[PDB]
Design a protein around this ligand. Structure first.
Ligand SMILES: [Zn+2]
Lengths: 185, 112, 357
C-alpha cells in the first residue's frame, strides 16, 4: 500500500524538455513525461553549482543553479528544507535528488538531498544516464509499434507481454500522444 | 531567457558560436601578477583569466567560464575551477566518444 | 496407528544393519517361543529387545532455519543443524546470588545459519556432550533475531535438544568440509526479496529516518538485553558485560530501479556520520528532556544534524529481513565507498548486451 517511486537518473535537458503532469488526485503524485515517453517521478541529477546560493534573510527559501552541460535547472527548498541550500557553494560538484516541480511554466527540482561528489562520480553519472537512456528508448521503440498498430486494447497488452514490455509503458505513450496533440492545436 | 549552459568542449573543438565552455585539462604555467594560468587538455593551450582562485602548476583542473573574444585574443574568463586531480581521464574520454556517437542518434529515435 | 509388519522390518534394517533374511529368522524364533504372537507383534517384540521400539517418539518436520522468524510460537520450532562453532561458556550473577551459565553454539543447515543460546542447566546438560560436527534437534525454543539478521534459538527450561536424531533433513546438511565463506552478491533493489542474505547494493541516500544509540557488548559489538529481574546487561555470548554505545543509522537507498530501508551498525555508522556514538547518545538525551520520545528524538536528530549525507552514493552489504511494520529492511553490516572504476566496468558489460559496444 505504502509505495515509494524510485528516482530516475536523467539529464537536465530531458527534464526541461519534458511535460509536467500535475496530479489533481490526492493519492497521486506529480510526474514528468520526457519526449521519449519516460514517466519520471523523482529526478536524480549530477552537476556543478554555477552561482552562489540565494538564501533568504528569514530562512524561508533557498535556491541554487545546477549545470550538468545539457541544461541549467533551479533547485529549491522551503522552511526546513532551506538547510540544503546552505551545504552548497558556487563551484561544487553535487548530486541532487528530489521531486520534479513546475513554477511559472518552468521546470525545477524540490530538493530532498544534496551532497558533494568525487569527480569520478560525475563520470559514473554520465555512464549510467547514457545507459538508461539507451535501455528506455529501445523498449519504447518496440512499444510505439504496438501502440501505432492496435493502441490500448486487450490484444495489444498480450503482445507487449511477449516482447518483454511492461503494460504501464503503453499507457505512458498514449498519455504523451495526448499531450503532443494538445500542443499541435 | 535562461542562463546558457557550460558547453563541454575540448580546446581544439572551440567553436566561434560557443559562449560558455567546460575545459578539463592540466595547468602548465601560473602568473600570479595578472591572475592568469595556462591550461593544456591534450588538444591545445588556452589562457585562463581567474578572478582570485589560482591553482598549482601540474594540478589537473576543470574550468567553467565565458569565452572572451576581442582584439586582444581568445582567452577563458574563469568562473568555476574544480579539482580533477583524482579523475580518471581515460574514462572521461571514453564516455565523451560514447555520447558523441549515441546521444544524437537517441534524440531522433522517439520523435513523433 | 501402529507401524505395519514391513515398516518394522525396514526400521530394524536401518537401526541394526541386519539383512531381511536375518530379521525374518529372528521373528520366527520369537513366534516359536510364543505362538500366540502375530507377525507384526513379533517384530515389535524384536525391536523392543534391540532398543528400537521407542519409534513412537517421532517428531519429524520439514522446517528450515531460513523459515525461523522472531517472536514465533516456540511449540512450532522444529529445526535441525550441524554445530559449526562452539563459544566458551560464560557466567552471570543473578539477583538471588546464584550464578547462572550461558553458552553459544553456531549451527547450520542447507538454507542458513542460527545461534543456539544455552541457558542455566541446559549448559551443563548439553554443552559438554555437544561436539563440532554433531547434528542437533532444536525444539520448543524462543526465537529471537540479532541486529545482523541472524536468528537465535534461546534454549530455556521449556526447550529440548536431541543429539543426533533420526530425521531425514540430517542428510541434506552439507559437511563441514564443503562449508565456504559466502561472498557478497550484487543485486538490484528491483530484484531484492525478503530473506535474502549477503547482498551488495550500490545506491544513493534519499532520506534519513533515525539516528540513535544502543547498548552493546564491548568485545563482540552486539546488542545487550537488560534483565530487570537480575539487574545486569547480558550478552548472549559473553555473559555479564558492561555495555557501550554504538550508532544505528536508518536511511533509504535508491539505485534508479528501487528503494529500500537500510540500517547501519557501530564502527561503520560512526564512519558515515562522523560523530562518535557517545556524542550521539548525549544529543538524544537533550532531545528526550525537551519532551520528545525516544523515536521522535532519533527522527529529529537525523533531519536536523545528519541531513548532509542525503545525496551521497554509497555501497552497502548485508542481509535483507522483513519487518512486521517497517517493511523490507536491508540490515547492512558493512559499508564502503563506491569503487568508481569497478562500477563503470559493470555498465560497460550491460552496454554490450544492448548492442552499443
Ligand atoms: Zn559479546
Amino acid at each position: 500500500s505504502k509505495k515509494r517511486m524510485p528516482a530516475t537518473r536523467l539529464y537536465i535537458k530531458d527534464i526541461l524538455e519534458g511535460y509536467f503532469v500535475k496530479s489533481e488526485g490526492d493519492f497521486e503524485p506529480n510526474y514528468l513525461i520526457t519526449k521519449y515517453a519516460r514517466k519520471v517521478y523523482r529526478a536524480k541529477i549530477v552537476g556543478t553549482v554555477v552561482r552562489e546560493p540565494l538564501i533568504a534573510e528569514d530562512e524561508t527559501y533557498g535556491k541554487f543553479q545546477v549545470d550538468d552541460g545539457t541544461g541549467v535547472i533551479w533547485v529549491l527548498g522551503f522552511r526546513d528544507d532551506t538547510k540544503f541550500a546552505k551545504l552548497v557553494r558556487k563551484g561544487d560538484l553535487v548530486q541532487v535528488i528530489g521531486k520534479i516541480a513546475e513554477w511559472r511554466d518552468d521546470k525545477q527540482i524540490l530538493v530532498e538531498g544534496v551532497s558533494k561528489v568525487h569527480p569520478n562520480m560525475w563520470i559514473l553519472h554520465r555512464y549510467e544516464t547514457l545507459k538508461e537512456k539507451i535501455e528506455h528508448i529501445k523498449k519504447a521503440k518496440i512499444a510505439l509499434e504496438i501502440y501505432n498498430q492496435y493502441g490500448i486494447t486487450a490484444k495489444s497488452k498480450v503482445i507487449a507481454k511477449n516482447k518483454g514490455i511492461e503494460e504501464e509503458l503503453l499507457e505512458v505513450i498514449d498519455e504523451l500522444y495526448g499531450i503532443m496533440m494538445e500542443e499541435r492545436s | 531567457r535562461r542562463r546558457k549552459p557550460a558547453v563541454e568542449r575540448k580546446i581544439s573543438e572551440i567553436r566561434e558560436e560557443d559562449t560558455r565552455v567546460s575545459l578539463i585539462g592540466r595547468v602548465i604555467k601560473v602568473d600570479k601578477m595578472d591572475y592568469m594560468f595556462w591550461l593544456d587538455d591534450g588538444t591545445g593551450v588556452a589562457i585562463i583569466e581567474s578572478e582570485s582562485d589560482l591553482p598549482k602548476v601540474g594540478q589537473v583542473v576543470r574550468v567553467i567560464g565565458r569565452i572572451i573574444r576581442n582584439e586582444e585574443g581568445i582567452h577563458i574568463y574563469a568562473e568555476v575551477i574544480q579539482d580533477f586531480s583524482d579523475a580518471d581521464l581515460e574514462a572521461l574520454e571514453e564516455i565523451r566518444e560514447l555520447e558523441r556517437k549515441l546521444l544524437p542518434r537517441l534524440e531522433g529515435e522517439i520523435v513523433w | 496407528s501402529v507401524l505395519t509388519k514391513d515398516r518394522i522390518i525396514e526400521i530394524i534394517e536401518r537401526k541394526t544393519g541386519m539383512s531381511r533374511e536375518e530379521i525374518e529368522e529372528e521373528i520366527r524364533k520369537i513366534m516359536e517361543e510364543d505362538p500366540y504372537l502375530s507377525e507384526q507383534g513379533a517384530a515389535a517384540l524384536l525391536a523392543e529387545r534391540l532398543g528400537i521400539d521407542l519409534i513412537e517418539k517421532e517428531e519429524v518436520s520439514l522446517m528450515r532455519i531460513s523459515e525461523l522468524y522472531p517472536g514465533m510460537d516456540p511449540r512450532e520450532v522444529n529445526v535441525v543443524g550441524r554445530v559449526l562453532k562452539k563459544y566458551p561458556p560464560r557466567e552471570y550473577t543473578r539477583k538471588d546470588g546464584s550464578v547462572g551459565r550461558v553458552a553459544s553454539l553456531i549451527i547450520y543447515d542447507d538454507s542458513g545459519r542460527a545461534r543456539v543460546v544455552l541457558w542455566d542447566a541446559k549448559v551443563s546438560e548439553y554443552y559438554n556432550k555437544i561436539e563440532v560436527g554433531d547434528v542437533i534437534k532444536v525444539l520448543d525454543a524462543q526465537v529471537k533475531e540479532s541486529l545482523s539478521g541472524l536468528p537465535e534459538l534461546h534454549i530455556n527450561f521449556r526447550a529440548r535438544i536431541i543429539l543426533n536424531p533420526d530425521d531425514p533433513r540430517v542428510e541434506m546438511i552439507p559437511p563441514l568440509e564443503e562449508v565456504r565463506v559466502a561472498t557478497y552478491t550484487r543485486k538490484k533493489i528491483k530484484d531484492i526479496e525478503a530473506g535474502d542474505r549477503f547482498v551488495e547494493v550500490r545506491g544513493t541516500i534519499a532520506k534519513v529516518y533515525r539516528v540513535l544509540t544502543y547498548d552493546a557488548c564491548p568485545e563482540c559489538k552486539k546488542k545487550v538485553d537488560y534483565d530487570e529481574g537480575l539487574g545486569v546487561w547480558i550478552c548472549p555470548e559473553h555473559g555479564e558485560v558492561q555495555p557501550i554505545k554504538m550508532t544505528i543509522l536508518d536511511f533509504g537507498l535508491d539505485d534508479g530501479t528501487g528503494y529500500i530501508r537500510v540500517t547501519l551498525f557501530g564502527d561503520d555508522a560512526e564512519e558515515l556520520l562522523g560523530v562518535s556514538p557517545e556524542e550521539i547518545a548525549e544529543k538524544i538525551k537533550e532531545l528526550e528532556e525537551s519532551g520528545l520520545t525516544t523515536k521522535e528524538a532519533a527522527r529529529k536528530l537525523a533531519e536536523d544534524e545528519f541531513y548532509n549525507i542525503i545525496g551521497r552514493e554509497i555501497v552497502v552489504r548485508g542481509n535483507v529481513i522483513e519487518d512486521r511494520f517497517l517493511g523490507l529492511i536491508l540490515r547492512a553490516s558493512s559499508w564502503e565507498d563506491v569503487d568508481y572504476r569497478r562500477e563503470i566496468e559493470r555498465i560497460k558489460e550491460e552496454l554490450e548486451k544492448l548492442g552499443v559496444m
